[PDB]
Amino acid sequence: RRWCFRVCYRGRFCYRKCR
């Protein structure tokens, strides 16, 4: 869905799910 958004797991775990 374009507009990536590195989601963070509250603490540091931040993953990018671009599209």
Curated annotation (Swiss-Prot):
A single BP term in Gene Ontology = defense response to bacterium
A GO CC term attached to the entry:
extracellular region
Question: Is Secreted found in the keyword set?
Answer: yes
* Keywords tagged on the record: Amidation, Antibiotic, Antimicrobial, Disulfide bond, Secreted
What is the annotated localization of this protein? Secreted
How would you summarize where this protein is expressed among tissues? Hemocytes.
Family of the protein in this entry: Belongs to the tachyplesin/polyphemusin family.
Its name, as the record gives it, is Polyphemusin-1
Q: Which organism is it from?
A: Limulus polyphemus
